[PDB]
Amino acid sequence: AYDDLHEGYATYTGSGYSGGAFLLDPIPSDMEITAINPADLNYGGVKAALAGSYLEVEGPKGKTTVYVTDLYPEGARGALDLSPNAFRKIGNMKDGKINIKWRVVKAPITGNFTYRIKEGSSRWWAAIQVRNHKYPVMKMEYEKDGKWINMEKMDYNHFVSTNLGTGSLKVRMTDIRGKVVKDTIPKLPESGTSKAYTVPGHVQFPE
């Protein structure tokens, strides 16, 4: 995050803008993105640890920054699958593969987290995704009865729990650096949400 380094290879793909595994839609068509190998994605034993992170990637021709929107299933350790507009900046498009170096960097964003409540969520079971986060989200907990409960991060880039209780939810997020922030999310319905929805958050990870 502050400092980090990875060696590997990039190729390029047209997928990941819609229907990517991390459910980060919609992604603007001009956005520089990448899919990420499973080993590096699940950093620290957390599924989709690096989902929605940003990477600076260096190729033979220069450097660029990409947003991580999708899983790269066949990728070895260190391997990335870039969007054409990113690959173009750091490599020769006449090559189908290039040597790269990359690192998690701070998100080029502004403002606070946004939360996405997956359809089917309720007090009984909920999947909560964090968006617009400056650094990878390693951990998400919510308070219930004076105790802090850990949520499992899923392959689809949402933190899940059961019996979260009623009322608004106090949550806290931990980034890849170990930085902790806290926030409150509106209450979950008694019955599974007919549709997914976003809710504005009020914190951000530190610079």
Ligand X SMILES: OC[C@H]1O[C@@H](O[C@H]2[C@H](O)[C@@H](O)[C@H](O[C@H]3[C@H](O)[C@@H](O)[C@H](O[C@H]4[C@H](O)[C@@H](O)[C@H](O)O[C@@H]4CO)O[C@@H]3CO)O[C@@H]2CO)[C@H](O)[C@@H](O)[C@@H]1O
Residue 42 or 64 having the CB closest to ligand X:
42
Phi, psi (deg, nearest 5) at residue 69: -115, -10
Interface with ligand X includes 193 (CB under 6 A)?
Answer: no
Sequence-ordered alpha helix ranges (H) in the chain: 38-41, 84-90
Interface with ligand X includes 189 (CB under 6 A)?
Answer: no
Residue 9 or 125 having the CB closest to a copy of itself:
125
Binds 174, which of a copy of itself, ligand X, none (CB < 5 to 8 A, cut-off by type)? none
Q: Which residues bind a copy of itself (CB under 8 A)?
A: 119-120, 122, 124-125, 191-192, 194
Residue nearest to ligand X (CB): 120
Residue 149 or 160 having the CB closest to a copy of itself:
160
Q: The tokens of 128 are what?
A: 């909560």
How far apart, in Å, are the Cα atoms of 152 and each of 48, 129, 161, 167, 181? 10, 11, 7, 21, 18
Q: How many CB atoms lie within 10 A of CB 5?
A: 8
> Which residues are registered as beta bridge partners of 162?
125
The three-state secondary structure class of 85 is helix
Return the range that interacts with ligand X (CB under 6 A); candidates 31-39, 49-57, 112-120, 168-176: 112-120
Counting every residue written for the chain, the total comes to 207
Return the range that interacts with ligand X (CB under 6 A); candidates 25-33, 94-102, 105-113, 115-123: 115-123
Residues near 155 by beta carbon (within 8 Å), at least 6 away in sequence: 21, 47, 48, 71
Interface with ligand X includes 162 (CB under 6 A)?
Answer: yes
Residue 110 or 194 having the CB closest to a copy of itself:
194
Q: Which residues bind ligand X (CB under 6 A)?
A: 118-120, 122, 124-125, 154, 156, 162, 192
